[PDB]
Amino acid sequence: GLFSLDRSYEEVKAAVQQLQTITFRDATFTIPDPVIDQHLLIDMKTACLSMSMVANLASELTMTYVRKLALEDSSMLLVKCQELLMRLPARPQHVSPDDEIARLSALFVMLRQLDDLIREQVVFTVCDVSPDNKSATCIFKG
Amino acid sequence: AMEANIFCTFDHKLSIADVGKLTKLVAAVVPIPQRLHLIKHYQLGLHQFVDHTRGYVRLRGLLRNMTLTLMRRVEGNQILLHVPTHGLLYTVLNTGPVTWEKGDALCVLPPLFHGPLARENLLTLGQWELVLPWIVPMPLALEINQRLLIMGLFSLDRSYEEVKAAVQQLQTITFRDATFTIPDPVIDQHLLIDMKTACLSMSMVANLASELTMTYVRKLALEDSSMLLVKCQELLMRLDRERSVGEPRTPARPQHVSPDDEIARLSALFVMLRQLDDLIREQVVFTVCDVSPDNKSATCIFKG
Amino acid sequence: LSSVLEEFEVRCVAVARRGYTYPFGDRGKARDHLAVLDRTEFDTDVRHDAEIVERALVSAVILAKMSVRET
Amino acid sequence: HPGFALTAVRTDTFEVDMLLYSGKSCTSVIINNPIVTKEERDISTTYHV
Amino acid sequence: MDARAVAKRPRDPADEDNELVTALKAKREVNTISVRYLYHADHQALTARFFVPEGLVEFEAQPGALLIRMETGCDSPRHLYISLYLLGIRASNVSASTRCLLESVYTASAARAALQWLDLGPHLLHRRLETLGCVKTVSLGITSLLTCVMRGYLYNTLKTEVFALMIPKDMYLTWEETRGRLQYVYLIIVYDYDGPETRPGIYVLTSSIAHWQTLVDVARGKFARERCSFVNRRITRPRQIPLCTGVIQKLGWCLADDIHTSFLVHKELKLSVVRLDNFSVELGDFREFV
């Protein structure tokens, strides 16, 4: 729903052909006719409003935490992060324990409503699994 | 009929003095990794998850999947362990550092004992001990979980005194009744991988989200529904002071970008939240009503 | 001194912007010097200005020494 | 000595063992049978007669 | 391993004699106490007794009113049990005439201490509160001992009468024009943002919606104006970062058909209120959102 806009309609088809597939747990799966909709447009506005506000909540050091790490340390997980981010010691600009804890607590408010748009309420919590795999006991019913 | 219970036994023999130490724990939560019937004591407790290089995040991330279970009635050679049911009353011991006022929203957290010794040692047994998670009121768990996340960002820069003093204050919480300092995640001049995975989980969204939202807000702004998207665009600049008489009024946006590589940045953004998801949402698991005198026993309806 | 005298309050008030935030081992002691720091003014007589400066710098240096843990 | 007179007051607590006389059959005392309501503390079960 | 035992239907506790009677039967003694039947032996509902100051007893003698703990600095008391009505004087949703009405009834230094405690701190009200349930069986005294339901239906002892929850008509509002056969009750604080202070906006929004996703989304319809007040403040005041716009928590559920207009009677002052009837309690927790 995000990729479809601000992009050529033929370019969207290359992503829809592949993003609908999922290879979770070895077995492949396919979405039945995904379509951009006004039902997604409210899902777009709730994300574009929430994700943009998260940009004005990270501390000036917290956003710099990546660049602080790469100058001193590197790892296989970090190497993928270097490509995902924008192309191109030292004193922190300020370190206020109260200002930092306040901006942090407000940042979690945006995330708890942000994760939920892809989260679903749990319907069952398995405890045991039958060898036949046809059925299993569960907890926390909806 | 007898109430349904979980039998448990010790492979090690119990001394008569050791059996009496369990009598103090008769009304205390004992986490269990998985629902079962007979259970070896090596499986019992949170102690099996103890690790060296692994940090505090590994304990809570596995503890959330664990099945909480009350102590019931020790039989000597066996131990009952009834599993609480949702919506029903169940006593819990005040194992946690903080006293419990009536109506507080309790929730489980792994223990965070600090430097100098206090009450702690209880059940040494075969070079093994039965540690228990702290039971804490919800508002405090909202704070204690955050104090570690800030100190992990400061792990990179112990060199300067300003951060070196600021870490000491977050290390020392100040609340009602007795304070209990939170041990420093930093050790051996390098952060543990679990807190590093947590700090990276936030640091990606802290930066990668900034340049990815710019592409989409500009097109939705034309629709002019609630008008917030136009005001939201000024928020993207992340300015504090008002703009000086110079550029840019418009927020920074990515240029060109490969047609397919831009898709990878979007999937990479949300996946970091899943590693952070254990820290995103504390959840209540007990709700006390009336509290016993001397803030020891408690009466809590079960949750979850 | 009236040109410097107006600027003097700006740099003086700016210290309070950081003094409320900077951690200390006894926040209740440093707060007293911050309270005196914001009460600074200037009497119409020029002669009183010399006393307020000592009332400020002495209260202020006690705060600044703690940042490096100076005795 | 100033110009002010002073008149402090001071209460004093005295233990007292009262006697209580009353006439015969001065009042009725109708009573219902005592009843045991049951609460439910999660371990021990308190009652209230 | 008795096959005759597994085939048995479960034995009711009522089929057995009362546990006190089982002890007396062995000695065949007859105590003066009537152990023939145990009162309050059949209650799925949970309750607890709460001592309350006499200065907050008003608009609580009628059974069915929210109790919310409120910590405030000093340990003496460590907490206070505000009424939903007493909190309405702070609410902007209440009509100016209705606000002046009940506020005169709360003319006590103890009730006056509540309004002062809301003013002393920058911290937002929603984190200071914690719902405990609803009023039942008021002690009525110099220091009332209110009983409060933690879960289940409100009702009179021996189930002789079912207590009804009372919610003021101004705080109550509806979304869908077609109620379902069932709908959950929610307490929903909604801050609207302003210069000197972020004013609270109390609401109680019963809705057939149960899933958290659709509930907050339909909530963004009528409450969209507050969202513009919040985003405007976020850019207005750098180094000032208020959180949220509103807060939702489940209060329970109701049959919807029971709802009807009603009014409280206290101190010769009628006060119209929406009247939930068979309000089973199902307390949840505050859920932050924008």
Swiss-Prot record, chain A:
Compartments reported by the entry: Virion; Host nucleus
Transmembrane segments: none
Role noted for this protein: Structural component of the T=16 icosahedral capsid. The capsid is composed of pentamers and hexamers of major capsid protein/MCP, which are linked together by heterotrimers called triplexes. These triplexes are formed by a single molecule of triplex protein 1/TRX1 and two copies of triplex protein 2/TRX2. Additionally, TRX1 is required for efficient transport of TRX2 to the nucleus, which is the site of capsid assembly.
Family to which this protein belongs: Belongs to the herpesviridae TRX2 protein family.
Assembly with partners or alone: Interacts with TRX1 and major capisd protein/MCP.
This protein's name: Triplex capsid protein 2
Organism: Human cytomegalovirus (strain AD169) (HHV-5)
Encoding gene (name): TRX2
Residues of the full protein shown: 154 to 306 of 306
UniProtKB/Swiss-Prot annotation, chain C:
Superkingdom field: Viruses
Disulfide links within the chain: none
Post-translational modification (record): Phosphorylated by host CCNA2.
Protein name per the record: Large structural phosphoprotein
Function: Participates in the last steps of viral maturation and release. Associates with nuclear capsids prior to DNA encapsidation and later preserves the integrity of nucleocapsids through secondary envelopment at the assembly compartment. Interacts with host CCNA2 and thereby blocks the onset of lytic gene expression to promote establishment of a quiescent state of infection in undifferentiated cells.
Family: Belongs to the herpesviridae large structural phosphoprotein family.
Subunit note: Interacts with host BICD1 and RAB6A. Interacts with small capsid protein UL48A; this interaction links together the capsid and pp150. Interacts with host CCNA2.
Compartment(s): Virion tegument; Host cytoplasm; Host nucleus
Portion of the full sequence shown: 73 to 143 of 1048
Signal peptide: none
Gene: UL32
UniProtKB/Swiss-Prot annotation, chain D:
Localization: Virion; Host nucleus
Assembly and interaction partners: Homomultimer. Makes the hexons and eleven out of twelve pentons. Interacts with triplex proteins 1/TRX1 and 2/TRX2; adjacent capsomers are linked together in groups of three by triplexes, heterotrimeric complexes composed of one molecule of TRX1 and two molecules of TRX2. Interacts with scaffold protein; this interaction allows efficient MCP transport to the host nucleus. Interacts with capsid vertex component 2/CVC2. Interacts with the small capsomere-interacting protein/SCP.
Family designation: Belongs to the herpesviridae major capsid protein family.
Described function: Self-assembles to form an icosahedral capsid with a T=16 symmetry, about 200 nm in diameter, and consisting of 150 hexons and 12 pentons (total of 162 capsomers). Hexons form the edges and faces of the capsid and are each composed of six MCP molecules. In contrast, one penton is found at each of the 12 vertices. Eleven of the pentons are MCP pentamers, while the last vertex is occupied by the portal complex.
UniProt name for this protein: Major capsid protein
Taxonomic lineage: Viruses, Duplodnaviria, Heunggongvirae, Peploviricota, Herviviricetes
Record gene name: MCP
Complete-protein stretch covered: 1029 to 1077 of 1370
From Swiss-Prot, chain E:
The UniProt record lists the keyword Translocase: no
Molecular functions (GO terms): DNA binding
Domain of life the protein comes from: Viruses
Location(s) in or outside the cell: Virion; Host nucleus
Record keywords, A-Z: Capsid protein, Host nucleus, Virion
Main localisation: virion
GO biological process, one term: viral capsid assembly
Entry-linked Pfam families: Herpes_VP19C
Biological function: Structural component of the T=16 icosahedral capsid. The capsid is composed of pentamers and hexamers of major capsid protein/MCP, which are linked together by heterotrimers called triplexes. These triplexes are formed by a single molecule of triplex protein 1/TRX1 and two copies of triplex protein 2/TRX2. Additionally, TRX1 is required for efficient transport of TRX2 to the nucleus, which is the site of capsid assembly.
Family statement drawn from the similarity comment of this UniProt entry: Belongs to the herpesviridae TRX1 protein family.
Name of the protein described by the UniProt record: Triplex capsid protein 1
Organism: Human cytomegalovirus (strain AD169) (HHV-5)
